[PDB]
Structure formats: C-alpha cells, structure tokens
C-alpha cells in the first residue's frame, strides 16, 4: 500500500522506530549542505576508523532511534542517549554512494555544522528512507495545520 500522514504518524510516534548501527565518526564542517562536502568528511571518517582498527579499535556500537524528536544516538551497551538531534537541527542527508551499508547527516545551528557518519548494520536504504518521510510528515501536518 502506500504511507499515509496516518501511517507515518504511528510509526514515528513516542520511541519511534530504531536501528542498530556504529558510529563511524564526527566532524565539523563549513556548510550545512552538500553532496562534495558530505562525502569528504564520510571517506575522512572512514580513513580514521581504519587506521584504528588497524590498532585493535573498533566503531562504538549504538541505536539510532528515529521519531517525531528527531534522531537520538543511544550507546548499545550502558543506554546512554550519546546525541540527541532534533529534526529542525538536521539539514541534510547524505547517501554514500561507495556503501549500501553507510549513510550521513548533518546537523547544528548556522556557523555550527558536524556531519555525523554512521555504519548500519543492516542495509542503510531503509534508514535514509524513515528520515525523508519523518521530514515529510511533520512538513504535511505544519502546512495542514497552517492552512487551519
């Protein structure tokens, strides 16, 4: 069928819906959008993770629960909530195009930029796919409740 405000409503109400990932890593950059500037910060995170797994480290285990709050980042072993982003803070979603397991966003006020790479642990569509439509429901319900 098809996913009506309705639908996506009760999927990303309360604890929303969540996924297990690890984080590849954080950086600041200058713009809150961009495909470029998405990818060099992905394949520079990427690096640093592989010159630390070379040395026994390894990518922190998390959740990443995607809801009507936005998207919280919540460490898999104690249940810590490790980020909290809220949607009106997420300015872009960037696929990366060189994994079907990897994906990021970037997130922050103006002047405030960090785009965020996470590693899924299952395929990384589904994912960036509950994002475009959590954006899209709370974009349908503002209009539908200006337009009130």
């Given at each position: 069928?098809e ?5 996506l ?8 819906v969540?996924?297990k ?14 495909d ?6 992905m ?11 070379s040395?026994?480290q ?10 009507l ?5 919540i ?11 809220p ?10 195009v ?10 922050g ?6 785009f ?5 642990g ?5 994912l ?9 429901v ?10 009130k």
């Amino acid at each position: 069928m098809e996913k009506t405000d309705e639908y996506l409503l009760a999927r990303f109400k309360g604890d929303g819906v969540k996924y297990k990932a690890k984080l590849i890593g954080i950086d600041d950059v200058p713009d809150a959008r961009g495909d470029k500037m998405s990818q060099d910060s992905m394949m520079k995170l990427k690096g640093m993770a592989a010159a630390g797994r070379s040395q026994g480290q390894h990518k922190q285990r998390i959740w990443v629960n995607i809801s009507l709050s936005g998207i919280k980042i919540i460490d898999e072993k104690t249940g810590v909530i490790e980020h909290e982003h809220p949607v009106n803070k997420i300015s872009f979603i960037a696929r990366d195009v060189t994994d079907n397991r990897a994906f990021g966003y970037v997130c922050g006020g103006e002047g405030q930029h960090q785009f965020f790479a996470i590693k899924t642990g299952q395929q990384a569509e589904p994912l960036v796919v509950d994002l475009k439509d959590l954006f899209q429901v709370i974009y349908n319900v503002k209009k539908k409740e200006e337009d009130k």
